[PDB]
Amino acid sequence: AFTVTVPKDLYVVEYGSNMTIECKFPVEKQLDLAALIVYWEMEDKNIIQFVHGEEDLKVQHSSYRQRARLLKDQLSLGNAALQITDVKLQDAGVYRCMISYGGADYKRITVKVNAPYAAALEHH
Amino acid sequence: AFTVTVPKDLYVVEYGSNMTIECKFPVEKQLDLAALIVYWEMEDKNIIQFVHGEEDLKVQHSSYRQRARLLKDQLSLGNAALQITDVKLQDAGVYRCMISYGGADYKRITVKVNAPYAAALEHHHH
Numbered sequence A: 001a002f003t004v005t006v007p008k009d010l011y012v013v014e015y016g017s018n019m020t021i022e023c024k025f026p027v028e029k030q031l032d033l034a035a036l037i038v039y040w041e042m043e044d045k046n047i048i049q050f051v052h053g054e055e056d057l058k059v060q061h062s063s064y065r066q067r068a069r070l071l072k073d074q075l076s077l078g079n080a081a082l083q084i085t086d087v088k089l090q091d092a093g094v095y096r097c098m099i100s101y102g103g104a105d106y107k108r109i110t111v112k113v114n115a116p117y118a119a120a121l122e123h124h
Numbered sequence B: 001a002f003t004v005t006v007p008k009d010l011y012v013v014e015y016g017s018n019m020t021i022e023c024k025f026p027v028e029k030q031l032d033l034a035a036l037i038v039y040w041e042m043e044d045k046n047i048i049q050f051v052h053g054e055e056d057l058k059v060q061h062s063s064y065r066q067r068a069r070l071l072k073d074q075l076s077l078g079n080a081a082l083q084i085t086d087v088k089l090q091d092a093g094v095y096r097c098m099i100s101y102g103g104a105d106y107k108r109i110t111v112k113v114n115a116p117y118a119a120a121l122e123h124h125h126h
C-alpha cells in the first residue's frame, strides 16, 4: 500500500530563515522518474511540481516565485523535500505534499512563522 | 496534459436533500480500472477512496458513513460523481476531487447548505 510519510508534521520557523519541509515516499528498485509526480501546495497555491519530465513554473503561484525548489537528486532516495528560502509571514499555514508513484497519497504539514514587531507591523 | 474539470464549482443545496457533485477526467474510449484512483475529501475528512476498482473503507470519515457513494456507473464516461444523501449543515464547505489516472490533478467545489430555523438551531447548539 503506497504511503507518503512526513517525519515532522509541524515546523516552527523564524521570519527570514530558510525552511526545508521533508516528505518521504517508498522507492524500492531504481527510481522510475517517468512514473513519478510530486506536487506541493499551500492553501490552494501551487508551490512547485515535478511531473514525470520536470518542473512547470508556468503554474507556480507568484508568492513562491524564485523562493521554492525541489531537491531533485534526493528523489531517488524517496525524498520529496521542499526548500523555501527567505521565509515570509504569508508562508505560515498548512502545506500538502502530494505524490503519485505506483499509487497516490498525500500528507499535511503545518508551518508556524515567528516574526519581530517590525515585520508583523508592515503586515498590518 | 492530464486535467480534472468541474462543470460546476458551486452547489447550493437544501438541507435534507440529496446532492451529486461531479469531477470529470479524460477517458480515451476504454477505462483502465487498474490505473484509476479517485479520492474525495472535504476539509481533510476522507469521503471516498476508490482504488483497484473498489471503494475502500474504513478510512472513510464517520460523518459520511452510509451517506456518501461514488456513482461507479459514471466512471467509464470519465465522471467521478460523489453522491451524498440526506444533506446536513456540516456538509457545507470546500470539497476536493483528487484523481490519478496516468497523470494526476485535483479540483475544488464549494457547497452551500440552506436550512430552516429548526435545523440551524440544533446545529447552533451542538
Ligand SMILES: Cc1c(COc2cc(F)c(CNCC(=O)CC(=O)O)cc2F)cccc1-c1ccc2c(c1)OCCO2
Binding pocket: A037, A038, A039, A046, A049, A050, A051, A056, A059, A098, A099, A100, A104, A105, A106, B001, B002, B003, B004, B037, B038, B039, B098, B099, B100, B104, B105, B106
Ligand atoms: C492530485 C494529486 C496530484 C496533483 O498534482 C498536481 C496538481 C496540480 F494542480 C498541478 C498544477 N496544475 C496542473 C498543470 O500543471 C496543468 C493542468 O492544468 O493540468 C500539477 C500537479 F502535478 C499529484 C500527486 C498525487 C495526487 C493524488 C491523486 C489521488 C489521490 C491522492 C493524491 O492522495 C490521496 C488518494 O488519492
